[PDB]
Design an enzyme around this catalytic site. Structure first.
Site, short mmCIF file in Angstrom:
data_model
loop_
_atom_site.label_atom_id
_atom_site.label_comp_id
_atom_site.label_asym_id
_atom_site.label_seq_id
_atom_site.Cartn_x
_atom_site.Cartn_y
_atom_site.Cartn_z
N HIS B 39 4.01 149.60 86.33
CA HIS B 39 4.23 148.93 85.04
C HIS B 39 3.71 147.51 85.02
CE1 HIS B 39 6.11 149.31 81.12
NE2 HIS B 39 6.81 148.19 81.28
N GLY B 141 13.95 140.94 84.79
CA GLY B 141 13.26 140.40 85.94
C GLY B 141 13.58 141.11 87.25
N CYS B 143 12.99 144.40 87.94
CA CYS B 143 12.07 145.49 88.22
C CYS B 143 11.43 145.30 89.59
CB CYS B 143 11.00 145.53 87.11
SG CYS B 143 9.99 146.97 87.07
C1 LIG Z 1 18.14 144.22 81.57
N1 LIG Z 1 17.53 144.94 82.68
C2 LIG Z 1 18.13 145.61 83.67
N2 LIG Z 1 17.23 146.14 84.49
C3 LIG Z 1 16.06 145.73 83.93
C4 LIG Z 1 14.75 146.06 84.58
N3 LIG Z 1 13.52 145.79 83.82
C5 LIG Z 1 12.86 144.58 84.03
O1 LIG Z 1 13.21 143.75 84.85
N4 LIG Z 1 11.72 144.41 83.28
C6 LIG Z 1 11.20 145.28 82.33
N5 LIG Z 1 10.11 145.11 81.68
C7 LIG Z 1 9.32 143.97 81.96
C8 LIG Z 1 9.23 142.93 81.06
C9 LIG Z 1 8.46 141.79 81.39
C10 LIG Z 1 8.14 140.59 80.75
N6 LIG Z 1 7.36 139.89 81.60
C11 LIG Z 1 6.79 138.57 81.38
N7 LIG Z 1 7.12 140.53 82.77
C12 LIG Z 1 7.79 141.70 82.64
C13 LIG Z 1 7.87 142.76 83.58
C14 LIG Z 1 8.67 143.84 83.25
CL1 LIG Z 1 8.77 145.17 84.40
N8 LIG Z 1 11.99 146.41 82.11
C15 LIG Z 1 11.54 147.42 81.15
C16 LIG Z 1 10.74 148.52 81.79
C17 LIG Z 1 10.28 148.49 83.11
C18 LIG Z 1 9.54 149.54 83.61
F1 LIG Z 1 9.13 149.54 84.90
C19 LIG Z 1 9.21 150.62 82.81
F2 LIG Z 1 8.50 151.62 83.34
C20 LIG Z 1 9.62 150.68 81.48
C21 LIG Z 1 10.37 149.62 81.00
F3 LIG Z 1 10.78 149.63 79.71
C22 LIG Z 1 13.14 146.70 82.84
O2 LIG Z 1 13.78 147.72 82.64
N9 LIG Z 1 16.18 144.98 82.84
#
Ligand SMILES: Cn1cnc(Cn2c(=O)nc(Nc3cc4cn(C)nc4cc3Cl)n(Cc3cc(F)c(F)cc3F)c2=O)n1
Ligand SMILES: Cn1cnc(Cn2c(=O)nc(Nc3cc4cn(C)nc4cc3Cl)n(Cc3cc(F)c(F)cc3F)c2=O)n1
Lengths: 301, 298
Positions: B39, B141, B143
């Site tokens: 991702h 953050g 992930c």
């Molecule tokens: C609230 N919560 C609980 N667990 C999570 C895990 N998670 C995460 O940390 N980040 C995600 N999306 C990103 C957005 C970004 C914005 N910037 C600047 N960089 C980013 C990197 C990421 Cl990975 N997501 C969403 C998500 C991550 C994936 F790997 C996926 F395959 C689908 C998804 F919808 C997330 O769930 N957040």
């Protein structure tokens, strides 16, 4: 999202645990710079542990009576001294993995992470609280003496607890790293009881805010109460009274949820008088009091 | 019983930050490879419906920013394996522990090192639910945070965190990039199946209760495994496998209570409810037979 009992990463502390043996008595020690800290109980033989004269026992020992093992490496003891209940062993090698650290004495109600060790080897990490009666409800087996409790504050490890003994009710007692016990205990092998415990009210309230943040809302109501009227009921049920300093500390969670502290207190008061009625909060059937407001903020902000 | 995690030090030294553009997450640096969720190659406009093969073709080694703290590790090769990106870097991690990759089954527990910007923040224990989610604790953050067990000297990596689902529970992959459960790595709402109670772990908890002297619920009767499994389904409990019966063997031997006799006891609790408590009014299902032994004996 979600809510878990979370400990601090233990890597900075794992590099400091060692085994200390004196005769056949053995326990865990903490190696920082060129000093090993450990419970002074290690200088007891089996006969001594019931009623030790520590000053006498210590003068009768020399540096080579102490065997300090860091993994497979043997550290050489070149000096020793007692500070209260903690033996300080000067060794000829400084620990190169010494973290930035300080020693702090914590207050009842505060939480810390425990690194449980056996024969100098880290085995598990978990979070617990200093109870108001100065015990901790830990998870410890034989051989855990000298395991440490700590918090991390940016880059700095604050050591606050060194494990000594189990009490007959199965809760645990220890010292700070200056060697002073939390609570009225003494480091000898006699059955000792603790004072009566109370529930940490400010922590319950923080946990109720975490439940709301995570969507568990069934216990809220539209009433409010005053501080004093809440404290009268709390005292009745063996809960700690709430001070204005506690009200302030919950400010950030009150702002995030829009539920005023005295509004929450009105919910907790109903729970104390009527019970959960088979309902749960964040999966628990009991009111949980071992999360501080700061713990909840770390995990929900 | 506390929920107790493994010490995290061997894993903390493997955590890095991976950035592609402004998209950032956590990666795992072992030897000269960095593993992370694929991702990371999405811009915000790609996250809802990414074509990963198309996005990867347009990436070069020099588009990937990998940092251990403030120190950049230059990427010299990249490949995609299912849902994980493997980044070859020019430096072998000198803190690489002995390690293996394992795929765990529902009911198994592991420790999670929660990380943000490549920095370790907290450790906790959890179990894989029968619907292939975990009830974790993760913020934005996180992930790329990993789950692991320690067997003696060796770290078994079993879980890479990817996403949060609408109900607040969490989903991810093993370290070969295969999802646990029927999920896909896009930013759409996906529903997990209905969760069930982990029966083998409930049985471990009842054995732990017996070990500690709390044994009112022991009944005089026995059942067959087939009879029990068909009853359990009716109450949203997982059926037992042959492997479950086997891993309960040591607790059965320690207490002298046959597994099927304990099943007949649980069956009664299921149909009649309890009145007193055990050890709690709720049956705990996130301690495995290993967790019980590790906390009762060592
Ligand atoms: C609230 N919560 C609980 N667990 C999570 C895990 N998670 C995460 O940390 N980040 C995600 N999306 C990103 C957005 C970004 C914005 N910037 C600047 N960089 C980013 C990197 C990421 Cl990975 N997501 C969403 C998500 C991550 C994936 F790997 C996926 F395959 C689908 C998804 F919808 C997330 O769930 N957040
Ligand atoms: C079940 N449990 C839970 N926590 C504890 C902690 N603890 C411990 O690990 N050891 C103790 N006594 C020793 C016996 C030894 C036998 N050998 C060969 N070496 C030994 C070393 C120790 Cl420390 N104790 C008891 C105890 C330890 C003290 F430090 C003290 F001041 C009074 C005490 F009664 C113990 O509680 N066991």
């Amino acid at each position: 999202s979600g809510f878990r009992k979370m400990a601090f990463p233990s890597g900075k502390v794992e590099g400091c645990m060692v085994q200390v043996t004196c005769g056949t008595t053995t326990l865990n020690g903490l190696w920082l710079d060129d000093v090993v800290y450990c419970p002074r109980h290690v200088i007891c033989t089996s006969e001594d542990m019931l009623n030790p004269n520590y000053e006498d026992l210590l003068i009768r020992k020399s540096n080579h009576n102490f065997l300090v093992q860091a993994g497979n490496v043997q550290l050489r003891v070149i000096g020793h001294s007692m500070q209260n209940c903690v033996l300080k062993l000067k060794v000829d090698t400084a620990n190169p993995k010494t973290p930035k650290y300080k020693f702090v004495r914590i207050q009842p109600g505060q939480t810390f992470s425990v690194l449980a060790c056996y024969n100098g080897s880290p085995s598990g990490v978990y979070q617990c609280a200093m109870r108001p009666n100065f015990t901790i409800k830990g998870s410890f087996l034989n051989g855990s003496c000298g395991s440490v409790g700590f918090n991390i504050d940016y880059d700095c490890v604050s050591f606050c607890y060194m494990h000594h003994m189990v009490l007959p009710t199965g809760v645990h007692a220890g010292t700070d790293l200056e060697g002073n016990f939390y609570g009225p205990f003494v480091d000898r092998q006699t059955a000792q009881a603790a004072g009566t415990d109370t529930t940490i009210t400010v922590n319950v309230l923080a946990w109720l805010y975490a439940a709301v943040i995570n969507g568990d809302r069934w216990f809220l109501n539209r009433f409010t109460t005053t501080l004093n009227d809440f404290n009268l009921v709390a005292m009745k049920y063996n809960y700690e009274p709430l001070t204005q300093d506690h009200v302030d500390i919950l400010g950030p969670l009150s702002a995030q949820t829009g539920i005023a502290v005295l509004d929450m207190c009105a919910s907790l008061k109903e729970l104390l008088q009527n019970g959960m009625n088979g309902r749960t909060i964040l999966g628990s059937a009991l009111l949980e009091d071992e999360f501080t407001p700061f713990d909840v903020v770390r995990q929900c902000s």
